[PDB]
Amino acid sequence: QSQINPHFLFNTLNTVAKMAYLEDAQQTSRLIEAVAAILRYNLGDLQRTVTLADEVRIAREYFFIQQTRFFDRIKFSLEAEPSCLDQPIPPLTLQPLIENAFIHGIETYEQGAELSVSVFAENGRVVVEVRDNGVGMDEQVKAELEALIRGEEPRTRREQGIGLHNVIRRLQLFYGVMDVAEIESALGKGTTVRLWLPRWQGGMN
Amino acid sequence: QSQINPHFLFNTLNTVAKMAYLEDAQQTSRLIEAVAAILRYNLGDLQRTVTLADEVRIAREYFFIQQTRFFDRIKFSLEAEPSCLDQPIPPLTLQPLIENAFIHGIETYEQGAELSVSVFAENGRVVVEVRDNGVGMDEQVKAELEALIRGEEPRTRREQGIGLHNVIRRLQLFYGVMDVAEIESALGKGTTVRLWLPRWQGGMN
Ligand SMILES: [Pt+2]
Ligand SMILES: [Pt+2]
Ligand SMILES: [Pt+2]
Ligand SMILES: [Pt+2]
Ligand SMILES: [Pt+2]
Ligand SMILES: [Pt+2]
Ligand SMILES: [Pt+2]
Ligand SMILES: [Pt+2]
Secondary structure, eight states: OOOOOOHHHHHHHHHHHHHHHHHTTTHHHHHHHHHHHHHHHHHHHTTTOOEEHHOOOOOOOOHHHHHHHTTTEEEEEEEEGGGGGEEEOSSSSSSHHHHHHHHHHHOSSOEEEEEEEEEEEEEEEEEEEEEOSOOOHHHHHHHHHHHHHOOOOOOTTTTTOHHHHHHHHHHHHHHHHHHOOOEOOTTTSSEEEEEEEEEOOOOOO | OOOSSSHHHHHHHHHHHHHHHTTOOHHHHHHHHHHHHHHHHHHHHTTEOOOOHHHHHHHHHHHHHHHHHTTTTTTEEEEOOOTTTEEEOOSSSSSHHHHHHHHHHHOOOOOHHHHHHHEEEEEEEEEEEEOOOOOOOOHHHHHHHHHHHTTTOOOOTTTTOHHHHHHHHHHHHHOOOOOEEEEOOOSOOEEEEEEEEOOOSSOOO
C-alpha cells in the first residue's frame, strides 16, 4: 500500500514555502516552488486531459530540481516543436519515461550520464522521444513491453509510481490505437522510448 | 495506483534542506527536518519492529508541523508513561490514528478542535488513546471496525495512506491476539480510538 500520506505532504510543503518566503530564502523558495508544482500536478485527476505543453512544463521543473542536485553527473536536454505542444494527452505520460531514463543514467555513470527529451511531428503523429545513454534495458522487460504495445497482456506477477506499462495502456485507451510506442535499446548503446501519438488538432474527450 | 514517486520526493526534500542551510533559513530548516523525519520513517520497511518511543517521536514531529500551520484552530496534547515507551510495536501504528483525529477536528471546527494522545499501562496492557472532540465517527464505519477487531472480515468494497483497518490487522498479527483496540464514539461527543497492546517487556519478533 502507500506508506505516505500525499495531502499532508503537499500542505506541509506549502508551510515550508511560506517560511522560506518569510526568511527571504530565495533559492530555497525556487526549489520548493518546483517540487510543489510537480506534486500538485501528480495529485490531480489522472483521467483529466492536459496538453504536451503541460507535460513539458512539469519536465522543466523536474530538470531544474535534478540539475541542482546532480549537475556534475548528468546532462539534460529538452527540445520541442511548439506546434506539437497543443496535443491533448493523458497527464503523467512523460514523467515516468523521464524518471526511467534518469535512473538508467545515474545507475550507469558516476559522471557522463545523458537524458534527452525531444517532441516533434512526423507524418500524422506527434513523436515524443526520451533517450538515455545507459547500459540498455533488460531484454525480457523490453519484450513484455512490446507485447503490451501489440495488445497481448503480459505475464501477471505478484507485487506489480506509475510505470511504463501504465503509460502505454493509458495512451492506447486515450487515443483508441494500440501502436503508441516503440522501444529502441541495445547493450552499451542506451535506450530510447519513442511515443507515436495520433496528431489531434484538439480532441480532449 | 500511486501518482507520486516518494524516492524523488525524499531526495528533493534533502536538496531543499541543503539550500535552506546554505541560505541560513533556520525556521525553514527546522520544518524541513521534521517532515523529512516523517517521510523517512514512513518509507522504512513496514515489517520492521520499532518501539512506542519511535512512534511518539514521529508524533511530536507531526504536531510541530501542524501547530505551525493550524495554531489558531487546534490544540494538541501528548502524554506518555516512560516505562511504556520500550513496548515493541509495528511502525505506523499511531500516525494513522492521529491523522484520523486531526481530520475529525479540522472538519468539525473553525477553531476549538482538540486532539489528545495518551500512552499508559493498565493491568497487563499498554493503552494508547487517541481522542478528538469531533462530531463522532459514522456508525457503520464503527461497526465494521468492531467486526474486524472481533475477527470477522468486513464487506469488501471497490477502491478500498494506511487506514485504521490496516493498523488493526497489523496489530492483531504482530501480537497474536485479536482484541487490540476499541472505539468509543458518540454524536457530538467525539471519538476515542483506544489500543490495548499486550505488554511485551521485549519481544520484537
Ligand atoms: Pt490532497
Ligand atoms: Pt493535512
Ligand atoms: Pt490531511
Ligand atoms: Pt529499464
Ligand atoms: Pt526511496
Ligand atoms: Pt530521484
Ligand atoms: Pt529516484
Ligand atoms: Pt472517522
